[PDB]
């Protein structure tokens, strides 16, 4: 602050990284194959089913159910930018189109509604800030009831 001597840092992110993933992270866009119609998340260049390069963006279903859930409460494993909210409710969310997303559940107003099979919907939230100072935004989920 008072002494502006540059501090060592191996890695600094270019804006290019997040720029290319705005579809995936703001809009839950994966990929669909034009030849066989198989769907994937996250986005990709080659269809895994048939190895076609004719692949297009696909808007994943933004509603789903909690497939599996696990609290993260261990201070030892608190990542920088995620230390303030404890517990965090980590979940695998099964979307209505069949895909599964690794995320977390937030804004739980009634704890008795937080259970396996509970319906959820996607929301845009602030995530850990980028190493180039830009705010990071991406998906999380809330209970939808």
Annotated binding site: 33, 36, 47, 50
* Region binding a second copy by CB under 8 A among candidate stretches 24-32, 52-60, 107-115, 130-138: 130-138
Contact 46, 35 (CB under 8 A): no
Contact 64, 116 (CB under 8 A): no
**Three-state secondary structure call for residue 47:** coil
**Three-state secondary structure call for residue 16:** helix
Q: How many residues does the chain have?
A: 145
Assigned token pair, 76: 């030892």
* Region binding Zn ion by CB under 5 A among candidate stretches 39-47, 59-67, 77-85, 108-116: 39-47
Q: Which of 63, 65, 67, 114 forms a contact with another protein (CB under 8 A)?
A: 67
Q: Which of 18, 64, 105, 120 forms a contact with another protein (CB under 8 A)?
A: 18
Binding-site ranges for a second copy (CB under 8 A): 1, 5-11, 13, 80-81, 83, 128-131, 133, 136
């Amino acid at each position: 602050s008072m002494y502006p001597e540059q501090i060592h840092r191996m890695t600094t992110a270019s804006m290019l990284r997040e720029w290319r993933e705005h579809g995936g992270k703001y809009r839950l866009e994966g990929s669909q194959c034009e030849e066989c119609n198989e769907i994937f998340f996250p986005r990709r260049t080659v269809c895994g089913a048939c190895n076609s390069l004719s692949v297009k963006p696909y808007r994943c279903a933004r509603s789903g159910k909690i497939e599996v859930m696990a609290p993260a409460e261990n201070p030892i494993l608190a990542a920088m930018g995620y230390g303030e909210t404890v517990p965090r409710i980590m979940a695998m969310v099964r979307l209505d189109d069949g895909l599964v997303i690794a995320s977390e559940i937030v804004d739980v107003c009634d704890q008795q509604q937080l259970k396996v099979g509970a319906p959820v919907r996607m929301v845009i939230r602030k995530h850990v800030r980028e190493s180039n100072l830009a705010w990071q935004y991406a998906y999380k989920f809330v209970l939808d009831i």
